[PDB]
Amino acid sequence: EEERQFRKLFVQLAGDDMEVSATELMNILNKVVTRHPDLKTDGFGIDTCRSMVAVMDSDTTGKLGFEEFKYLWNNIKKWQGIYKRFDTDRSGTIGSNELPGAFEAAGFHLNQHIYSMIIRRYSDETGNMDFDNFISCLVRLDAMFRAFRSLDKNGTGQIQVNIQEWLQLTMYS
Template sequence: MICFRLWNWFSTVDTDRSGAITAPELERALINGDWTPFDLDTVKLLMTLFDHDRSGTIGFNEFSGLWKYIKDWQNVFKHFDRDRSGSIDGNELRDALAQFGFNLSPSLLTLVQKKYANQTAAAPGHGFPGSAPTAPGISFDRFVRACVVVKQLSEAFTRLDSDRDGWIQINYDQFMQTVLTLP
């Protein structure tokens, strides 16, 4: 039954009937808990993670994996959104990242929080007509992106930190290659 519903949703989202979903089609398919659409940069990140054949689109099997991934992240988000505000504040973000094994310094945590904070928090009616303004903090989609980016950057750093002392010595080309090859 779930697979049939997921296929129906996939077919509905696949507006050009190509049998695959593009980033704009996926963006229209994904909404946050407050009915605001997913941030396009988050959609692009998800596309990169789930476009296994590197076609620039995702087929039904890739979409199924993405759907499960999003459902799993929803549970994580609900767990850390302790005040049930519908967004993640600084303390909740710190706790989430620490539980994932990323103990960021206060200055880095502030930077991540500012970078991924809801950009439309003060804009009433963002999303569907009659929708409420986005809560301050980090929305679900941007929380997923923040956590994935912190993980990717940390893994890239670890690959470069050959002696595992927390310091790396690389040249500009090595740094740019590392950052530009991240999904």
């Protein structure tokens, strides 16, 4: 299967340590997305890669575990398809007319106000967004929802944070 292949690659990279670095992850992802007829991207940069590693690095190592990798991978794979589905005219961007649906499909019911900020932060002048930013925005959004949830537990929707917890959850992403 697919994951069994990435396992081989993970073993070729870290062996038993089974932890990939940001640079190594970047190269793995770029072979797939950079060489895609429908994606229109230069591939993931190391900064994005470090974000990806940072948000998945549950046990503060600095690398990516294989299971963490799978969660991240199926996310990019899933969002990749949503990107292609909404970039129907193959222009290399998803428009302001399709983005709301792209986000709903990605797994996020965002409030108008929050949606508006996200768009302003990740869209270009025209209000359009490319594959790179789409994935970057979503990896962060998923990480921030996960960060919130880590401090929730009781399910109240209200959390208490001190500056150390704050910086830890926001800086390390």
